[PDB]
Amino acid sequence: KLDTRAMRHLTAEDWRVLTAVEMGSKNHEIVPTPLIEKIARLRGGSSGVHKSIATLAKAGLIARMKEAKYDGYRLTYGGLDYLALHTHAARKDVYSVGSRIGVGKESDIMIVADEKGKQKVLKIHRLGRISFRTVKRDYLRNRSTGSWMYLSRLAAIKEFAFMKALYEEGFPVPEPIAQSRHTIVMSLVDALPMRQVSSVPDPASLYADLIALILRLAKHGLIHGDFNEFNILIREEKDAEDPSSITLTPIIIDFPQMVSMDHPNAEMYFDRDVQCIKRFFERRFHFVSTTPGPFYKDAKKTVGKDGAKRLDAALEASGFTKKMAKDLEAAIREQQESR
Ligand SMILES: Nc1ncnc2c1ncn2[C@@H]1O[C@H](COP(=O)(O)OP(=O)(O)O)[C@@H](O)[C@H]1O
Ligand SMILES: [Mg+2]
C-alpha cells in the first residue's frame, strides 16, 4: 500500500532532488549521482543535495543501483506517488488524504479532500502489479520499473481525456478535476457499484438504461471495453411522491481501456460489453431481454449520425502518439487477459 507519513518530513530541496531524479530518468532508468546533482542545481548550487538523497533513499522514494558503469539511483513507485501528490497539493487540488485506501488489481482508489473540505477521489494507476501466493504486491519483471511507470502515466492521461470528453457531452461520468503522472483526481460520486445493489424491483428499466448507454457511447465512436457491474455505479433516489419507490441512475467509470468503434476488434469489444450486462442481469435478477442484440453491425451504422460528436478523437488532443496507444493497449490487454 501507500503511506503518506513521510510526506511532511520532506523539505523543499528534498522535493527538488526527488523531482531531479524524476527528470533525469527521462532517458535512462538509473540516474548517476552527479547527474542528480546537476539537475537539482538550485541557482546553483547544490548545495546539500547529497543529504536529501539519503533522506529520500531511507524513505524509499528512490533506490540505489550499482551497475557496471551506471552507479546512481532510480525513482521508486512510492517516489512517483509522492511527486504526483505534491503536484496536486501545489495546484491546490488536494489538501488532505483519507485514511481509507482501496487496493485494486489495476489501480488504487483513495479519498482526498481539498482546503474547503470537499471530498474527491484520487485514482492511482498500477499497471504491472501482481500478487504472489506462497506455496509452502509486486510488479511483473518482463518490464522495467520505468516502463510500468510510463504505462501507468499513459493510462491516467487517456482516462482523463475520455472522462473530460464524456463529461462535457453530458454522459453520466464523474467530473474530472486534475491529472498528474499516473493519477487522476475526480469527483466522488454518491453511488455504489451495481454489483452490490441490494434490491431492484424493475430490472427491465435498468437494463434498458444500460443498453442505451452502450448504444449512446457507440454513437459517439466509443466502446467502453470493461462495461460490467464493477464499473457501473448506481445512484439511488427516493421519489418525491412516494419513498417506497427508488429511482436508479447509472454512472459509468473506469476508462483507460476504451476503444474506438473503428478498432479492428470493435465487434468483439462491443459484443463483450453487451454480453457482460446480459450475464449479470441473468444471474442476479433472473432477467432476460426479449429484445435481440443489440448487435455491433447495427450500432456501427449510427456513428456519428445526427449531432454526434466523435469522442474517440479526444486522445489526439494530448500528444498521444500511435506508439503510445499501442503500448498502452498492449499492456491493458495483457492485464485483462490474465485476470
Ligand atoms: N468517482 C468515484 N466515485 C465513487 N466511487 C468510485 C469512483 N471511482 C471509483 N470508485 C470506486 O472504486 C472502484 C474502482 O474504481 P475503478 O475506476 O473501476 O478502478 P479500477 O481501474 O481499479 O477498476 C469502483 O468500483 C467504485 O467502488
Ligand atoms: Mg474498474
Oligomerization category of the chains in this entry: monomer
Question: Can you tell me the CATH superfamily of the largest domain?
Answer: Transferase(Phosphotransferase) domain 1
Radius of gyration from the CA trace?
Answer: 23 Å
Number of domains: 3
Terminal Cα span: 20 Å
Structural class estimated from helices and strands: alpha+beta
Q: Tell me about the largest β-sheet.
A: 5 strands, antiparallel
Beta-strand content estimate: 15-25%
CATH class of the largest domain: Mainly Alpha
| Number of E-state strands | 15
The count of helical stretches stands at 9
SSE succession = HEHHEEHEEEEEHEEEHEEEEHHH
CATH topology of the largest domain: Transferase(Phosphotransferase), domain 1
Strand order of the largest sheet: 4-5-6-10-9
Which outline best applies? elongated
**Bound ligands:** adenosine-5'-diphosphate, magnesium ion
Summarize the amount of helix as a percent range: 25-40%
PDB class: transferase
Keywords: protein kinase, ADP complex, phosphoaspartate, acyl-phosphate, ribosome biogenesis, ser/thr protein kinase, Ribosome biogenesis, Ribosomal RNA processing, pre-40S maturation, pre-40S, Phosphorylation, transferase
Assembly: monomeric
Entry title: Crystal structure of the Rio2 kinase-ADP/Mg2+-phosphoaspartate complex from Chaetomium thermophilum
